[PDB]
RNA sequence: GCUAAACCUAGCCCCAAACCCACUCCACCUUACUACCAAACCUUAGCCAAACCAUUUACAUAAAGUAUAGGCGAUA
RNA sequence: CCUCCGCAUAAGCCUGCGUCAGAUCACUGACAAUUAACAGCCCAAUAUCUACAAUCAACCAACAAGUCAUUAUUACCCUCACUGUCAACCCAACAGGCAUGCUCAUAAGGAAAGGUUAAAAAAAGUAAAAGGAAACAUCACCUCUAGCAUCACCAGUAUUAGAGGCCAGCUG
């Protein structure tokens, strides 16, 4: 979203211009997720996929800032949780293919405690953390029973 | 033309005045032909005791002493209500002593309330 | 009968009636729940008696015989109701551990502010409740500016109050 | 000067709380009245 | 060309959030919260069913789980059915021959002047004037008010002759009586569900009209079949039905035998009001229906030719116009197109008054005009049948 | 705005439908078409322009009967209530169509031409070339979009393999497939053109306010 | 605007009030194959007729009891036509309106721009009997015109508004069941049935079990005064030209199961304060208590079938003009 | 009771019961002539006709036969020194006709 | 000598310091203050100055109004 | 003596000539009231039905084409709650306006005159000798554009749709 001078001299009308990229519905095959996605993509993205030698590398290599898609970051969390768990659900009844795919991307091993939080927005992480530490409160009956059996076991040792 | 006045039921056209009521609670529901069915169970029954031979008048005599306010905490109610049964059955399954984990089977559930007042 | 809306017919026009104390709370914590139920109806009928006597007092343009015992009966109904709520609360903390009798949640309405939302009872679950889903419990970003403006209005009122307190203190030290 | 020809349906439908909250602009109307400190935010 | 534009149709939900496509991960939705939030994902709710049962929120099973969903479509004939081809279609569905004019057996009841209410012109003039003018507080009564009151008061005039004939003390007129009768016709099953005013019950059945020479003479008659109209137009194609034969009554009922069906057309609007040919068709199907149910109550569900044939007559009206019908049901083997046929005598367009002046014109006084009492002679002939 | 179109009924119905005037306004309540609005009220009779439709569990050609030739407020031609088998439907009337007339809705494309009567509907392969037709489709199964107003007619000019060429009343020729159904004869209510409105009352009663060769086209 | 007197009324003790409005003395009392046909109608409506749609309890007295009473009247006017030829030529109106409009008393306007002015307080009864029988000739009076009777008419000591009685303004009608051009202006008998509100089951559930029979009695006085009174207006009498002969009609009113019988003898149309000065005369309403026609109906037949109730129906249908 | 959330009734549920009644009542003297059976009361706004019947039946053992209620508008026309309207509170009135004569 | 006149103290302003608020009960996005049924982001523009207006036109200290930019002008 | 006004409902207003008391051409405070039958407030699904105007409706007469309807199966048993009800009133003006039903001079509602004098000028009314004036829209027509379907045109289809143009008499 910018402006131009009308015939590339500053002494003409300053009038505003939008430069839109060229979009292409293409289709990809993530080997780690093992799925064909239909993704709208640009020519520069196809070029970066070629330079990374695959969409799994393109997603696991590119930084969150640089990639700049929520969907690409969700693919990244999907692949990283698939690598962080060494999931048998990649290719069931084909363990050699699983171990080959998992050893191809051994470079990006992240622990599972970190791979869940990858690419969450701040509100979505607020939600996930809200569901972690939500609990039904403990009925004070049980707390008072614990304290009183503690006290009667202090009196038992007297 | 007033904004300051409270919007009450006395105030609109006919269609407005019919809908809005005061704070009273619905007892049944409307049916076809605008025929109100009253449901017996939605009407509150005033459970009222028998006051015969009852020794408490509305006032207390001024000759009664002064005491100290001790609000009933759950520690106290646990102590007197539960603590003898645990002391007896410990010197010799928590549901034995008047505890209930759930209360979905219960008529007077404590959270959320179903009783009134 | 209807004669329970009026007191003893000997007391009519006596302009002073000896009534005792109110119930304090600690006197009432010694009574059973059946006994507090019955005392509730004793005080209830007494309260209706005194309210008819007030309204007839204003009607006949006269003063009340003794307006104090209305204050005492409201005092006792308040104490009794508070005791019963104490026992409900303590039992609720033991059996469930909740603190409110009624559920709710901290939400955040269209106006950006954080509100304790008290839940209501419904029959259908919330996702297909057509009227519940018209309420917005989120604030869009055009609200945050007004949140900041409200924040600063509160800060100005607080600053003015605190400063004004210090000025009054200086006047007290000049006067004494 | 009989320009105001009253009805309560037009008044609540034009300027009530629900029409005010129906749009973002109207929510900002309420917020300005709430910030000026007004006793009536709407009809 | 399909009907119903897209703007009035159920709007499609927006397409799912892309997180539901990624195989590994659970999405984070606003279902943890209990309200919409636009920066979380829209969750997918399980199909909720109300556990208990409440009548004002009942949602009935689809049209297969109904315990009588017969695949073979039954065409039903209720009282509202306005037929297309008029009388010919009811003659086909009924398997009957038509005979214009009432028989001499019925009209000969009022041959002598002894079967007459005294001053029948004055009395019928007072019934017309009462219902059509003097009846209610309104200046003109609508057809809704005048129609059943005209029919009702004419039946009271004919009821006043218990003095001359004791036998009329053995007939009542019931209302809100709903009969039903199913029969097969060539290929597909038919049913009449009869819900009309004033079925006049008797203890005694009506004596038959047609001799066996005429019943036998119906064999050489052919039903005038028609085309392109498949002869089940404007009936109600129902799949969810029950084959049943109802006389309208429990068994062991005094006054069990239908005499006259007084069916009327009391709708205020000309669009609503039945056309007189369709009125006649409705009478043929109702008299056929009640007579047929009488045959199934007396003789089982046996497709045969009846030895005691049943006769049920009916009077239908718009208010000022009368249509008489005598129906002679003598076979129950309906499905073939041959053998003996039922036979019916009609009176078409027997108006008893051309017009009624409720307000005087300025010239013509208040009252009816074009009064012709031969039609009440026909009415009173039908009331005195079997007495 | 709260514009919900009345054009909302899903099932075909023989009854008139209460329809709502637009007033020339959009769905956004702004006048897009000047000089509409404020007529006498009308109800809409749903016309079946798919002239050959076999009914449920039927196929092939089928006869139908005209019950009533009815004036229609929603258009210039008058219409016919026409019943066949177990269904009535409103079709659009040809010039000589009486009550009681029988009309064959045909599908079979004959080897020879079909000497059709005045008001029946045939695929364009089954017509003598150089006859007046009306209610012409554009696709097999499209429904009859053209040659539809009062007294109008178009002549089947010539046909090639699986293709007929029509002359519309604007004399622009149209290339349609062979197996598209068109009805023969000219549309009814002739001398709808030859008429004097006389006063502006009738201008206002029809919902009207005051105000402020091409190439032979194909569908193959 | 005028009070709007409902005969079939929920109001407590509406009887005593209607004797005030009406100027009536209520005196208690009165001045074979029929059993077969009656039980045929009872069993016809409860048992023998097959209902398509299920008859709910609220829907009952609209569906069940109304054609029962219709069939009773039509069949008894059938069978009793030889014994009483006046019923052979008598009109039989089903659910046909009777209106009467009269003025009774004076009220000074308590508030507003018309305050302190004499405004006489008008009343209207709009009624629909279930079915009424009207004869062209008039029944003989029961008691003589200007019959003294020592029991006194009630006097209410508050505004009639206090009996939940409300005012409206609408068309003042005086109507007997048909317009004045009809030759059958006089009235024989009138059959009412109490609506679903006034069931004695509810009146026992609410503590007004006393008012049960009162309901019957109120429907007696309001309806018949509105009928006889209206008849008196069709013969030209009104409040200043009072009736020179007593007008008489007759009403069996019911709950569908319990019947009560009433006679009414209108002696005065002079109800206004101008016309109640030299007016010793008053209207008299004779009445019975309610008695059940049958007791129960099981599967097949009736049980506990009273016969005196049919005899009082018949004795109502059997009297004659002269 | 008043100012309490009532528990929701579902079809086949228990009876709604109130143990300590929240709302008081006062019987006033009528300002106009009233029938001898009638008794006038000032119900609080939320109390229905049915609640008043069961209220007098349960607590006071009065055989009530009819109840009729009207809501009375208190004036909003009287002002402060600040030209601000004071509202006299609206109140509900019950007319109770006693049974058994 | 009438009308009047006088009056200090409510409070406020500018700093500093310090990071604020918000469920007695009940009701409150439906016609808010009503007990209870099948979807957010997308360049601010212009005034004005240039004595018109058309590109343009401001939104700790010190280097420094320096380098720079600019109808190489206003100015930045 | 007026009455072209009334009385009700609607919309609107919200206690605004009820009682007690007091201050002020000659409102404040207290208390009390409007009681439901009238009117609002409705409706279990899923399918499937709804060609024949109204007009005293009879024909007759038409065009601008019209304000009104169910059936099939399933589920269904409790019942009279809630709200409106007052007034001399509203929108204006510092003249006017107002929907509907009845009454069509009233059974209902009201008062043109503070007292006087009887100047001018001004307003209104009556009488007066003799004379008797001293452009746009649009039927219809023409032109141009447009071969077509699910938000107007239009649920229309070139006979269509859209845009254009056109003397005697009387009298202050
Ligand atoms: Mg009220
Ligand atoms: Mg400048
Ligand atoms: Mg009513
Ligand atoms: Mg009023
Ligand atoms: Mg007057
Ligand atoms: Mg003067
Ligand atoms: Mg002048
Ligand atoms: Mg002159």
CATH code where residue H57 lies: 3.30.70.330
Chain F 19..58 CB hits on strand J (< 7 A): 19, 21-22, 24-27, 32-36, 39-44, 46-47, 49
- Scanning every strand, the nucleotide with its C1' closest to B38's CA turns out to be J79
What DSSP element (H or E) covers E189? strand E188-196
Q: Return the H-helix or E-strand segment holding C152.
A: helix C144-175
Pairwise CA distance, residues H101 & H96, whole Å: 13
What is the token pair recorded at H86?
Answer: 């004071």
Distance CA F73, CA F91 (A): 14
Q: How far is the C-alpha of F89 from the C-alpha of F51, rounded, in Å?
A: 10
Chain D residues closer than 8 Å to B13 by CB = 7-9
3-class SS of residue G274: coil
Number of domains in chain E: 1
- Nearest nucleotide from residue G111 CA, by C1' atom: J18
User: Do G18 and G125 touch, CB atoms closer than 8 A?
Assistant: no
Sign of CA dihedral F86, F88, F91, F97: positive
Q: Which domain holds residue D17?
A: 1-43
Judged by a CB distance cut-off of 8 A, whether residue E232 touches chain F is yes
Distance, in Å, from the CA atom of C145 to the CA atom of G73, rounded to the nearest integer, reads 82
Residues forming beta bridges with residue A14, ordered by sequence position: A5
Give the separation between CA A139 and CA C97, rounded to whole angstroms.
4
Collect residues with CB below 5 Å from ion ligand 1: H 70
Q: In degrees rounded to 5, what are phi and psi of residue C77?
A: -65, -35
What is the distance in angstroms measured between the alpha-carbon CA of C116 and the sugar C1' of I22?
9
Distance, CA of H41 to C1' of J81, in Å: 19
User: Does residue G268 contact residue G285 with C-beta atoms inside 8 Å?
Assistant: no
Distance CA C17, CA C69 (A): 9
Residue labelled with tokens 């300590």: H20
Backbone angles phi, psi at C86, to 5 degrees: -65, -45
User: CA-CA distances (angstroms) from residue G243 to A20, C137, E59, F90?
Assistant: 101, 78, 65, 68
Which residues are bridge partners to E324 per DSSP?
E315, E347
For tokens 């409206």, the residue is G168
Q: Nearest chain G Cα to H100, which residue? A: G210
Cα-Cα-Cα-Cα dihedral sign, residues H68, H71, H74, H75: negative
| Structure tokens given for A58 | 């393109």
Residue C73's φ and ψ, nearest 5 degrees, are: -75, -40
Write phi, then psi, for F98 (nearest 5 degrees).
-95, 165
Q: Are F169 and F154 in contact (CB under 8 A)?
A: yes
- Based on the structure, what is the number of domains in chain D? 1
Report d(CA G297, CA B86) in Å as an integer.
65
Could D9 and B11 be called an inter-chain contact, meaning their C-beta atoms sit closer than 8 Å? no
Beta-carbon contacts of residue F124 (< 8 Å; ≥ 6 apart): F133, F156, F159, F164, F166, F176, F177, F178, F179, F180, F182
Q: Which residues contact B78 (CB under 8 A, 6 or more apart)?
A: A140, A141, A144, A148, C94
* Angle value at C-alpha G204, between G199 and G209, nearest 5 degrees: 100
Query: Where residue D29 sits, what CATH number does that domain have?
Result: 1.10.287.3980
Q: How far is it, in rounded angstroms, from Cα C85 to Cα C80? A: 9
Query: Of G107, G137, G110, G131, whose CA–CA distance to G120 is shortest?
Result: G107
Strand, coil or helix: E200: strand
* CB-proximal positions of chain I, under 7 Å: 10-18, 20-23, 25-43, 55-56, 70-71
Neighbours of chain D (3+ CB pairs under 8 A): B, C
- Residue G260's nearest CA partner among G71, G84, G30, G2 is G30
Residues of H in contact with G204 (CB under 8 A): none
Instruction: Report the C-alpha gap between E349 and E280 in whole angstroms.
Output: 10
Cα E196 → chain centroid: 6
Shortest Cα distance, chain B CAs vs residue H31, angstroms: 23
Determination method here? cryo-EM
The residue among E316, E314, E378, E387 whose CA lies nearest residue E104 is E378
What is the rounded CA–CA span in Å between residue E277 and residue B44?
62
Q: Do B12 and D43 touch (CB under 8 A)?
A: no
Domain hosting E304: range is 66-387
Retrieve residue A6's tokens: 């009308």
Is any atom of strand J within 7 angstroms of residue E84's beta carbon? yes
How do the domains of chain A map onto residue ranges? 1-158
| DSSP designation for E56 | G
Q: How far is B3 from chain D (nearest CA, A)?
A: 6
The resolution of the experimental structure, rounded to one decimal in Å, is 2.4
Q: Given the structure tokens 């019908």, which residue do they identify?
A: E325
Of G304, A45, D39, the C-alpha closest to A37 is A45
CA distances from G117 to E331, G109, G169 (A): 82, 6, 19
- Can you tell me the distance from the alpha carbon of F176 to that of F182, in angstroms, rounded to the nearest whole number? 11
Q: CA B36 → C1' J43, Å?
A: 11
On whether any CB of chain H is under 8 Å from the CB of E58, the answer is no
Closest CA to H68 of B107, E207, E322, G166: G166
Looking at residue E308, the DSSP 8-state letter turns out to be E
Residues of C (101-120) whose Cβ lies below 8 Å from D: 110-111
Domain region containing H36: 1-101
Residues 100-129 (F) near nucleic chain J, CB < 7 A: none
Which residues share a beta bridge with C104? Answer: C118
B113 touches strand J (CB under 7 A): no
Q: B23, H2: Cβ pair inside 8 Å?
A: yes
B15 touches strand J (CB under 7 A): yes
Most E CBs within 10 A among A124, A126, A135, hence the mutation to make, goes to A124
Q: In this structure, is the dihedral angle defined by the CA atoms of residues C58, C63, C66 and C67, taken in order, positive or negative?
A: positive
DSSP code string of H77-91: --B-SSS-B--PPPE
The structural domains of chain F, ordered by start, are: 1-106 (2.40.50.140), 107-187 (2.30.30.30)
Return d(Cα C126, Cα B111) in angstroms, integer.
Answer: 19
Where do the H-state alpha helices sit in chain B?
14-19, 74-90
CB < 8 Å to A147, chain B: none
| Residue E303 domain-assigned (yes or no) | yes
Residue of E117, E140, E148, E162 to mutate for G, most G C-beta atoms under 10 A: E162
Nucleotide nearest to A14 (CA to C1'): I55
């Amino acid at each position: 979203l910018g402006q131009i001078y009308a015939n590339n001299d500053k002494l003409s009308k300053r009038l505003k211009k939008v430069w839109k990229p060229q979009l292409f519905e293409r289709e990809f095959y993530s080997e780690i997720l093992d799925k064909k996605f239909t993704v709208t993509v640009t020519m520069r993205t196809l070029d970066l996929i070629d330079e990374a030698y695959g969409l799994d590398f393109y997603i696991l290599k590119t930084p969150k800032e640089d990639l700049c898609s929520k969907f690409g970051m969700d693919l990244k969390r999907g692949m990283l949780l698939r690598l962080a768990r060494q999931d048998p659900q990649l290719h069931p009844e084909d363990p050699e293919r699983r171990a080959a795919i998992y050893d191809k991307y051994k470079e990006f091993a992240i622990p599972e405690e970190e791979a869940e939080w990858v690419g969450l927005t701040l509100e979505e992480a607020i939600e996930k953390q809200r569901l972690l530490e939500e609990k039904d409160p403990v009925p004070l009956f049980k707390i008072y029973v614990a304290e009183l059996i503690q006290q009667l076991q202090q009196q038992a040792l007297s | 033309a007033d904004r300051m006045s409270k919007w009450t039921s006395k105030r609109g056209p006919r269609s407005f005045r019919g809908r809005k009521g005061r704070g009273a609670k619905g007892i049944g529901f409307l049916t076809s032909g605008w025929r109100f069915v009253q449901i017996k169970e939605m009407v509150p029954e005033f459970v009222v005791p028998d006051l015969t031979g009852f020794k408490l008048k509305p006032y207390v005599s001024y000759l009664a002493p002064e005491s100290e306010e001790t609000p009933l905490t759950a520690a106290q109610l646990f102590s007197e209500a539960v603590a003898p049964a645990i002391e007896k059955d410990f010197k010799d399954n928590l549901e034995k002593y008047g505890f209930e984990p759930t209360q979905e089977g219960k008529l007077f559930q404590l959270y959320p309330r179903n009783f009134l007042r | 009968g209807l004669e329970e809306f009026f007191d003893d017919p000997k007391n009519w026009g006596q302009e002073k009636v000896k009534s005792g104390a109110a119930w304090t709370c600690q006197q009432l914590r010694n009574k059973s729940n059946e006994d507090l139920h019955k005392l509730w109806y004793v005080l209830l009928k007494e309260r209706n008696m005194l309210l008819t006597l007030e309204q007839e007092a204003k009607r006949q343009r006269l003063p009340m015989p003794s307006p104090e015992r209305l204050d005492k009966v409201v005092d006792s109904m308040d104490a009794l109701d508070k005791v019963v709520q104490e026992r409900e609360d303590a039992l609720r903390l033991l059996q469930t551990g909740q603190e409110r009798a009624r559920p709710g949640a901290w939400r955040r309405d269209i106006f950006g502010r954080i509100i304790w939302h008290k839940f209501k009872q419904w029959v259908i679950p919330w996702h297909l409740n057509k009227r519940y889903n018209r309420k917005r419990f989120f604030a869009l970003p055009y609200v945050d500016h007004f949140l900041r403006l409200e924040r600063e209005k509160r800060a100005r009122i607080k600053a003015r109050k605190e400063n004004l307190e210090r000025k009054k203190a200086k006047i007290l030290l000049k006067k004494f | 000067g009989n320009e105001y020809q009253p009805s309560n349906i037009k008044r609540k439908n034009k300027h009530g709380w629900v029409r005010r909250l129906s749009t973002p602009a109207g929510v900002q109307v309420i917020l300005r009245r709430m910030l000026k400190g007004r006793k009536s935010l709407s009809h | 060309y399909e009907w119903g534009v897209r703007s009035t149709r159920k709007s499609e939900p927006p397409p799912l959030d892309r997180v539901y496509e990624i195989p590994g991960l659970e999405p984070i939705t606003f279902a943890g919260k209990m309200h919409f939030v636009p920066w979380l994902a829209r969750p997918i709710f399980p199909p909720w069913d109300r556990g208990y049962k409440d009548p004002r929120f009942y949602r009935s099973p689809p049209l297969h789980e109904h315990p009588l969903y017969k695949d073979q479509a039954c065409y039903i004939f209720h009282h509202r059915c306005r037929l297309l081809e008029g009388v010919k279609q009811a003659l086909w569905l009924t398997k009957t021959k038509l005979i214009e004019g009432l028989p001499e057996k019925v009209l000969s009841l009022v041959d002598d002047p002894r079967n007459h209410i005294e001053n029948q012109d004055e009395c019928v003039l007072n019934v017309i004037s009462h219902a059509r003018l003097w009846q209610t507080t309104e200046e003109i009564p609508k057809r809704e008010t005048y129609c059943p009151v005209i029919v009702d008061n004419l039946i009271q005039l004919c009821k006043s002759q218990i003095l001359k004939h004791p036998s009329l003390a053995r007939r009542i007129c019931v209302q809100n009586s709903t009969f039903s009768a199913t029969w097969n016709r060539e290929s597909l099953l038919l049913q009449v569900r009869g819900s009309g005013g004033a079925r006049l019950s008797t203890k005694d059945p009506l004596p038959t009209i047609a001799s066996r020479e005429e019943i036998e003479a119906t064999k050489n008659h052919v039903l005038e079949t028609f085309y392109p109209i498949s002869p089940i137009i404007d009936l109600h194609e129902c799949n969810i039905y029950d084959v049943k034969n109802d006389t309208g009554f429990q068994e062991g009922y005094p006054y069990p035998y239908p005499h006259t069906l007084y069916l009327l057309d009391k709708a205020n609007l000309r669009p609503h009001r039945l056309q007189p040919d369709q009125l006649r068709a409705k009478m043929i199907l109702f008299a056929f229906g009640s007579a047929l149910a009488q045959a199934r109550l007396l003789y089982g569900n046996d497709a045969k030719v009846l030895e005691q044939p049943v006769v049920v007559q009916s009077v239908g009206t718009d208010g000022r116009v009368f249509h008489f019908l005598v129906f002679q049901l003598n076979t129950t083997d309906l499905d073939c197109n041959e053998g003996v046929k039922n036979l019916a005598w009609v009176d078409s367009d027997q108006l008893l008054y051309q017009h009624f002046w409720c307000l005087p014109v300025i010239v013509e006084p208040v009252g009816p005009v074009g009064f012709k009492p031969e039609t009440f002679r026909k009415f009173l002939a039908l009331y005195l049948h079997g007495a | 705005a709260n514009f919900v179109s009345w054009k909302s009924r899903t099932k075909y119905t023989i009854t008139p439908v209460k329809m709502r005037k637009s007033g020339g306004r959009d769905h956004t309540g702004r006048i897009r078409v000047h000089g509409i609005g404020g007529g006498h009220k009308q109800r809409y009779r749903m016309i079946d322009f798919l002239r050959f439709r076999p009914e449920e569990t039927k196929s092939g050609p089928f006869e139908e009967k005209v019950i009533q030739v009815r004036y229609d407020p929603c258009r210039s031609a008058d219409i016919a209530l026409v019943a066949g088998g177990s269904r009535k439907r409103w079709i659009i009337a040809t010039e000589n169509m009486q009550a009681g007339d029988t009309i064959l809705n045909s599908n079979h494309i004959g080897r020879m031409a079909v000497a059709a009567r005045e008001g029946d509907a045939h695929p364009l392969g089954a017509l003598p070339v150089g006859t007046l037709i009306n209610n012409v489709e554009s696709e097999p199964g499209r429904g009859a979009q053209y040659i539809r107003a009062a007294g109008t007619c178009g002549v089947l000019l010539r046909k090639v393999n699986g293709t007929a060429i029509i002359q519309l009343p604007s004399k622009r020729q149209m290339q349609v497939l062979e197996t598209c159904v068109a009805t023969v004869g000219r549309v009814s209510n002739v001398d709808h053109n030859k008429r004097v409105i006389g006063k502006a009352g009738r201008n206002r009663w029809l919902g009207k306010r005051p105000n402020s060769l091409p190439p032979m086209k194909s569908y193959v | 605007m005028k009070y709007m007197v409902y005969p079939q009324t929920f109001a407590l003790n509406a009887d005593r009030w209607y004797q005030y409005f009406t100027k009536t003395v209520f005196l208690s009392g009165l001045p074979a194959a029929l059993r077969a046909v009656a039980c045929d109608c009872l069993l016809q409506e409860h048992f023998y007729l097959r209902r398509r749609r299920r008859v709910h309890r609220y829907e009952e007295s609209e569906v069940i009891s109304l054609p029962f009473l219709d069939q009773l009247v039509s069949t008894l006017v059938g069978l009793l036509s030889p014994h009483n030829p006046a019923l052979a030529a008598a009109a039989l109106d089903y659910r046909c309106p009777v209106h009467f409009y009269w003025v009774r008393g004076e009220e000074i306007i308590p508030r507003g721009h018309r305050r302190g002015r004499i405004d006489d307080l008008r009343y209207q009864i709009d009624d629909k009997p279930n079915n009424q029988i009207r004869i062209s000739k008039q029944l003989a009076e029961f008691v003589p015109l200007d019959y003294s009777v020592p029991i006194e008419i009630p006097t209410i000591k508050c505004k009639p508004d206090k009996l939940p009685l409300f005012k409206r303004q609408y068309e003042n009608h005086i109507f007997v069941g048909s317009k004045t051009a009809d030759p059958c202006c006089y009235g024989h008998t009138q059959f009412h049935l109490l609506p679903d509100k006034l069931r004695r089951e509810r009146l026992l559930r609410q503590n007004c079990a006393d008012q049960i029979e009162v309901v019957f009695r109120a429907n007696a006085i309001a309806s018949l005064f509105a009928w006889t009174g209206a008849q008196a207006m069709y013969q030209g009498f009104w409040s200043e030209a009072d009736v020179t002969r007593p007008f008489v009609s007759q009403a069996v009113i019911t709950d569908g199961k319990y019947f009560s019988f009433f006679c009414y003898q209108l002696n005065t149309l002079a109800l206004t304060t101008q016309a109640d000065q030299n007016n010793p005369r008053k209207n008299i309403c004779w009445g019975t208590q309610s008695k059940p026609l049958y007791e129960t109906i099981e599967d097949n037949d009736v049980k506990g079938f009273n016969d005196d109730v049919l005899l009082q129906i018949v004795h109502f249908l059997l009297n004659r003009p002269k | 009771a008043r100012n309490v959330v009532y528990p929701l009734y579902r079809l086949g549920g228990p009876q709604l019961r109130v143990f300590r009644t929240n709302f008081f009542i006062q019987l006033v003297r009528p300002g106009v002539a009233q029938p001898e059976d009638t008794v006038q009361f000032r119900i609080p706004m939320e109390m229905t006709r049915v609640d008043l019947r069961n209220y007098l039946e349960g607590i006071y053992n009065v055989p009530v036969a009819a109840v009729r209620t009207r809501v009375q508008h208190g004036s909003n026309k009287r002002r402060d020194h600040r030209n601000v309207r004071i509202k006299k509170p609206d109140y509900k009135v019950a007319y109770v006709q006693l049974a058994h004569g």
